From TrEMBL, chain B:
Family the UniProt entry places it in: Belongs to the RNA polymerase beta' chain family.
Source superkingdom: Bacteria
Lineage: Bacteria, Bacillati, Actinomycetota, Actinomycetes, Mycobacteriales
Residue numbers of the full-length protein present here: 343 to 391 of 1316
Name assigned to this protein: DNA-directed RNA polymerase subunit beta'
Subunit details: The RNAP catalytic core consists of 2 alpha, 1 beta, 1 beta' and 1 omega subunit. When a sigma factor is associated with the core the holoenzyme is formed, which can initiate transcription.
Function text: DNA-dependent RNA polymerase catalyzes the transcription of DNA into RNA using the four ribonucleoside triphosphates as substrates.
TrEMBL record, chain C:
Organism: Mycobacterium tuberculosis
Described purpose of this protein according to its UniProt entry: DNA-dependent RNA polymerase catalyzes the transcription of DNA into RNA using the four ribonucleoside triphosphates as substrates.
Highest taxon of source: Bacteria
Family statement: Belongs to the RNA polymerase beta chain family.
Stretches assigned to the RNA polymerase Rpb2 domain: 26-98
Name of the protein in question: DNA-directed RNA polymerase subunit beta
Assembly description: The RNAP catalytic core consists of 2 alpha, 1 beta, 1 beta' and 1 omega subunit. When a sigma factor is associated with the core the holoenzyme is formed, which can initiate transcription.
From TrEMBL, chain F:
Annotated protein name in UniProt: RNA polymerase sigma factor SigA
Region of interest called Sigma-70 factor domain-2, as start-end residue ranges on this chain: 32-102
Motif position, Interaction with polymerase core subunit RpoC: 56-59
UniProt-annotated stretches for the region Sigma-70 factor domain-4: 200-253
Region annotated Sigma-70 factor domain-3, chain positions: 111-187
Subunit structure: Interacts transiently with the RNA polymerase catalytic core.
An annotated GO BP: DNA-templated transcription initiation
DNA-binding region, residue range(s): 226-245
UniProt lineage: Bacteria, Bacillati, Actinomycetota, Actinomycetes, Mycobacteriales
Residues of the full protein shown: 264 to 527 of 528
Species of the source: Mycobacterium tuberculosis
A GO CC term attached to the entry: cytoplasm
Automatic annotation (TrEMBL), chain G:
Superkingdom, taxonomy of origin: Bacteria
Record text on subunit structure and interactions: Forms a complex with the RNAP catalytic core and with free principal sigma factors.
Presence of keyword Transcription regulation: yes
Alphabetical list of InterPro entries matching this protein: RbpA_sf, RNApol-bd_RbpA
Family: Belongs to the RNA polymerase-binding protein RbpA family.
High-level lineage: Bacteria, Bacillati, Actinomycetota, Actinomycetes, Mycobacteriales
Organism: Mycobacterium tuberculosis
Pfam families linked to this entry: RbpA
Protein name per its UniProtKB record: RNA polymerase-binding protein RbpA
DNA sequence: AGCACAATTTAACACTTT
DNA sequence: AGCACAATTTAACACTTTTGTCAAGC
DNA sequence: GCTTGACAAAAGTGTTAAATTGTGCTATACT
C-alpha cells in the first residue's frame, strides 16, 4: 500500500510470493554471472551489479 | 551463490537447445535445484557449500 | 587505554549503524536489556531517540546535527534504515512482505 | 511408457510437483479431512488434524 | 625528539586522486583566492585520538 | 528439409523408411555419449580442488563430449578417445578460465597468469628461494613493470562474512568504515557556506552578481560561457570578461575575503 | 588500524530540485508476450526501435518501422560440421547403402 | 529454465509439501531430486474399458 | 554436549485368508 | 597450453571550431 | 560603458592503427 513506507503504518502483512509478484518487483533480468570489470572496475552489463 | 545459480541455469538453457540425452539434463536440473537450495538455506539438505 | 567518547564518527557498510571499539571511534552498544529497562521506565521518547536518529535514520542524523548547531528543535524521527534492509532480505526469500 | 504409455502421464522433479499441485482440489481434501476427524479415531484421526 | 599530540602529522603521504569535479561554490572560492585544484588526495599518518 | 518444400511429395514407403532412418540416427547420438560419460568423469576428476566444484567440471566435460561427437571422423582410423580427449580437456580448462573467479578475467590474461605462475614456481625450485620481478621478466620476455601489474590482477576477493578474531561474534564487515557516507559536520558547513556566499554576493551590484552566478553556475548548476552571458546582456565576450575581471578584483577586497577565507 | 573502503562511486551535494528539469518524451515498446513498457527519453535523442525491456526480453517500438533482421545466421548446425568434412557423393553412396540394410534385415 | 521447489516448504518440520500432497518426506526427496518417477495422472475410462 | 520435544520407524498385536 | 582469426574497444593524431585574452578606440 | 581585430589555447570530430577480447581447433590410446 505504501512502498515508500514513510510514517504511515497500520498493518504489515506477510504472504507467499507468486511468480507474477517476483517479476513485478524486479527492474530487469540478470542473465550473466559477472560482477565487475577487472580493469576499469566498472560494473558490467546484465550482471550482478549492472 | 547467485553466480552458481545463474551459471547452472545458463548451462541448462544451453543443454536444452543443443539437444541432449535425458541423463545430462536430469543431472543439470538436480544441480540447479541444489544451487537454489544452497542459496535460500545452506547446510539443510546434504552437506553445506 | 580505557576512556572513550564519541559524538559522531564512522558508520558501517550494509546497515548504517556506528562502528565499535576504541581502535575505530565506535559507539557504546545499547543492547536488549537496556531497552527492557527503558521500556520498564516508561520513557518512550528516549528509546525512540536512541534507536532512530542516533543509529539508523540516515536523513535524521544530519538533520539533528544541523538543528543542534543552528539552535533549533530536534525534529521528529523517520524510519530506521536497518528495517528497510529487513524488508529486502525478506523479499529476497520470496515472501510478499507488504 | 513404451507399452500402455497412452493411459497415464509421469514425470520427475519440481515440474511434476507443480503438475500435482495443479490437479489438487482443496475442497475435496478439506471435506475428507473434516469427516475423518469427525467419524474415525485412532492414529488416523491424530494424523488428519 | 619532536613532541607530538593528538592530531599531529607523523608521515606526510599524498595519494594521487585522478578525477572529480568541484561544486560551483568551491570553484568560485578557488577563483577568488587563487589556489589550484591539487588533484592528489591527502592521506597522511596522524596519531590516534588521545 | 530439402524435400519438405517444392520439388516432390514422397510415397508412404520412402517416408516410412527415411523417418525410421532419421529416428535410428537420433539414437546412436545418445548411445555414444552414454558410453563415454565415464571417460568424461575420469578426465574431469584430476582438475578438482581449484575454483570449480566437481559436478560443474563433469557438465562442462559433457558439453565438450557433445562437441567431440559432433566433430568426429571415423575414416581417419583412430579410436574415439584419442580425439575426444582434446575437446574434453579444452572444455574443462576453458570453463576454469571463464567461470572460476568472482571478477571475470579474459582467457589470454588467465593464460599469461598461468604461464607466470609456472615460470615462478620453476625458477623457485631451481633457485631454492623466491624469485624477483626483474628476475621474472627475464624469463617471460616482458618488462618488469608488467610483471607486478600482472601479479596485481590475480588477487581474489577476501570474503566479508568470516569471523576474524577468536572471539567469534565479530566478522570482517563490522570493521570496514564506510568512506562514501555523509559526514554530518560537513553537510552543515556547506549549507552555511552557501548562505555566506549569497550574503557576500548581495553586497555587489545587480549585474555583476548575475554575471558571477551565471559564470560559475550558482543558480542553475550548469556553468555558462562568456558568449552565453553576452547573449542575455547584449554585449560581446570582451565586455562580459572585463566585468568579471573587475568583479573578481572587488571580491578580493579584505571585507569580502575575510569572511570567506575560513572555508578553505 | 581502521580500514576504510568504498564501493566505487560518488556523492554530490547539489540540493535537490523539482521544478525546472529538461523536458522528456515517452516511448512505448512492446515485447513478444504482449507487454507494454514506457521509457522516458530526452527530447534531443534518437528514439531507438528495439529496447531491452524490464521483462528481460527485447521489445520493438509500437510503430511499423521494421528496421533490421540484420541477416544473423544459425551458426554450426551439426550438418554443417558434417558437410564440411564429408561430401555429398560419399553420403549418398552411404545412406542408400544403409537404406538397403533396412531392406535385407527386415526379411532376413 | 526449469522449476525449483522452495526449500522452506519441503525441508521443514513438519514438511508442508508432504502434508499438502500426502506424500512421505522420504518419497518427496526421491521425487524432487530425480530418483523416482511419479505418476501424475491416469485416464480411468480407457483403463477401465 | 546435552537437554527437551515432536515427527518418524521396528515390532508386537489381534483379525482375517490359505 | 597454445595458436589462429574475426570483432570490438581504445588511443592517437590532424584538422576544424569554440572559447578566451590583449591592445586600440569612441 | 561599450565594440573590433587579431591571435592563441581548448574542445570537438573523423579516421586509423593498435590492443584487447571472444571463439574454434588440436586425431596412438586413455572409460
Amino acid at each position: 500500500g505504501a512502498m515508500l513506507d514513510v510514517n504511515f503504518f497500520d498493518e504489515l502483512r506477510i504472504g507467499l510470493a507468486t511468480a507474477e509478484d517476483i517479476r513485478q518487483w524486479s527492474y530487469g533480468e540478470v542473465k550473466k554471472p559477472e560482477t565487475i570489470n577487472y580493469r576499469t572496475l566498472k560494473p558490467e552489463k546484465d550482471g550482478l551489479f549492472c | 551463490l547467485y553466480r552458481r545459480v545463474i551459471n547452472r541455469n545458463n548451462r541448462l538453457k544451453r543443454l536444452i537447445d543443443l539437444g541432449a540425452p535425458e541423463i545430462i539434463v536430469n543431472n543439470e536440473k538436480r544441480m540447479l535445484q541444489e544451487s537454489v537450495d544452497a542459496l535460500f538455506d545452506n547446510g539443510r539438505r546434504g552437506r553445506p557449500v | 587505554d580505557k576512556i572513550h567518547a564519541r559524538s559522531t564518527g564512522p558508520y558501517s557498510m550494509i546497515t548504517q549503524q556506528p562502528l565499535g571499539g576504541k581502535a575505530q571511534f565506535g559507539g557504546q552498544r545499547f543492547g536488549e536489556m537496556e531497552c527492557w529497562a527503558m521500556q520498564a521506565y516508561g520513557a518512550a521518547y528516549t528509546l525512540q531517540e536512541l534507536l532512530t536518529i542516533k543509529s539508523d535514520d540516515t536523513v535524521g542524523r544530519v538533520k539533528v546535527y544541523e538543528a543542534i548547531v543552528k539552535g533549533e528543535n530536534i525534529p521528529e524521527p523517520g524510519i530506521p534504515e536497518s528495517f528497510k534492509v529487513l524488508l529486502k532480505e525478506l523479499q529476497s526469500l520470496c515472501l510478499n512482505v507488504e | 511408457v513404451d507399452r500402455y504409455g497412452e493411459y497415464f502421464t509421469g514425470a520427475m522433479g519440481a515440474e511434476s510437483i507443480q503438475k500435482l499441485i495443479e490437479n489438487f482440489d482443496i475442497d475435496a481434501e478439506a471435506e475428507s479431512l473434516r469427516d475423518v476427524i469427525r467419524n474415525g479415531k485412532g492414529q488416523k484421526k491424530l494424523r488428519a488434524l | 625528539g619532536a613532541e607530538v599530540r593528538d592530531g599531529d602529522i607523523l608521515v606526510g603521504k599524498v595519494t594521487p586522486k585522478g578525477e572529480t569535479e568541484l561544486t560551483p561554490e568551491e570553484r568560485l572560492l578557488r577563483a577568488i583566492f587563487g589556489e589550484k585544484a591539487r588533484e592528489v588526495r591527502d592521506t597522511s599518518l596522524k596519531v590516534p585520538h588521545g | 528439409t530439402e524435400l519438405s518444400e517444392r520439388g516432390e511429395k514422397l510415397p508412404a514407403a520412402q517416408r516410412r523408411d527415411m523417418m525410421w532412418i532419421c529416428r535410428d540416427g537420433d539414437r546412436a547420438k545418445n548411445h555414444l555419449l552414454e558410453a563415454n560419460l565415464r571417460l568424461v568423469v575420469s578426465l574431469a576428476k584430476r582438475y578438482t580442488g581449484r575454483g570449480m566444484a566437481f559436478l560443474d567440471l563433469i557438465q562442462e566435460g559433457n558439453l565438450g563430449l557433445i562437441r567431440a561427437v559432433e566433430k568426429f571422423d571415423y575414416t581417419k582410423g583412430y579410436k574415439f578417445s584419442t580425439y575426444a580427449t582434446w575437446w574434453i580437456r579444452q572444455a574443462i580448462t576453458r570453463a576454469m578460465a571463464d567461470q572460476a573467479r568472482t571478477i571475470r578475467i579474459p582467457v589470454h590474461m588467465v593464460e599469461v597468469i598461468n604461464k607466470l605462475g609456472r615460470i615462478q614456481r620453476e625458477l623457485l625450485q631451481d633457485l631454492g628461494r623466491e624469485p624477483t620481478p626483474e628476475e621474472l621478466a627475464k624469463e617471460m620476455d616482458i618488462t618488469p613493470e608488467k610483471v607486478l601489474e600482472i601479479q596485481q590482477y590475480a588477487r581474489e576477493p577476501i570474503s566479508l562474512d568470516q569471523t576474524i578474531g577468536d572471539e567469534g561474534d565479530s566478522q570482517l564487515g563490522d570493521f570496514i568504515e564506510d568512506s562514501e557516507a555523509v559526514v554530518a559536520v560537513d553537510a552543515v558547513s556547506f549549507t552555511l557556506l552557501q548562505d555566506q556566499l549569497q550574503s557576500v554576493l548581495d553586497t555587489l551590484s545587480e549585474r555583476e552578481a548575475g554575471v558571477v552566478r551565471l559564470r560559475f553556475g550558482l543558480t542553475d548548476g550548469q556553468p555558462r560561457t562568456l558568449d552565453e552571458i553576452g547573449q542575455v546582456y547584449g554585449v560581446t565576450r570582451e565586455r562580459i570578461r572585463q566585468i568579471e575581471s573587475k568583479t573578481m578584483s572587488k571580491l578580493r577586497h579584505p571585507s569580502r575575503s575575510q569572511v570567506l577565507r575560513d572555508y578553505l | 588500524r581502521v580500514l576504510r573502503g568504498s564501493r566505487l562511486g560518488a556523492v554530490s551535494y547539489e540540493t535537490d530540485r523539482n521544478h525546472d528539469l529538461a523536458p522528456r518524451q515517452i516511448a512505448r515498446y512492446r515485447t513478444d508476450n504482449g507487454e507494454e513498457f514506457e521509457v522516458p527519453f530526452a527530447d534531443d535523442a534518437e528514439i531507438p526501435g528495439t529496447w531491452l525491456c524490464r521483462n528481460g526480453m527485447e521489445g520493438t517500438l509500437i510503430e511499423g518501422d521494421l528496421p533490421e533482421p540484420k541477416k544473423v545466421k544459425p551458426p554450426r548446425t551439426h550438418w554443417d560440421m558434417l558437410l564440411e568434412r564429408r561430401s555429398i557423393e560419399e553420403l549418398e553412396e552411404l545412406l542408400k547403402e544403409r537404406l538397403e540394410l533396412i531392406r535385407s534385415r527386415r526379411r532376413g | 529454465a526449469a522449476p525449483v521447489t522452495h526449500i522452506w516448504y519441503f525441508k521443514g518440520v513438519p514438511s508442508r509439501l508432504g502434508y499438502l500432497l500426502d506424500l512421505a518426506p522420504k518419497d518427496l526427496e526421491k521425487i524432487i531430486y530425480f530418483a523416482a518417477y511419479v505418476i501424475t495422472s491416469v485416464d480411468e475410462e480407457m483403463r477401465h474399458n
